[PDB]
Structure 1
């Protein structure tokens, strides 16, 4: 009495495979405040 859910994991693996990209997209943005967060602190210290 099945119903074909073959399209389901075919849909979501494109979804969950996409989520690593937009995961990796933000990490390249957060390090900008990381590096600039403390080279400010050098110039304040000296």
Structure 2
């Protein structure tokens, strides 16, 4: 008797890996939102 969840380990890792790209790249955009606001408020004060 035997089954193989050997293939799953390699495939799930991949999922984990892209989520990392989606997560990292997603964050890159929020930073544009955050920095532009600090600049807007700075002009906003004067």
Per the shorter chain, which TM-score range? Answer: 0.7 to 0.9
Structure 1 residue 19, shift from structure 2 partner: 1.0
In the TM superposition, structure 1's runs of 4+ consecutive aligned residues that sit over 3 Å from their partners are none
Structure 1 residue runs of 5 or longer lacking an equivalent are none
Aligned residue pairs total 46
CA RMSD of aligned residues (A): 1.0
Distance 1:4 1:45 in 2: 63
Q: CA deviation at 1:6?
A: 0.9
TM-score by length of 2: 0.84
Distance 1:44 1:5 in 2: 58
Q: TM-score, normalised by structure 1?
A: 0.84
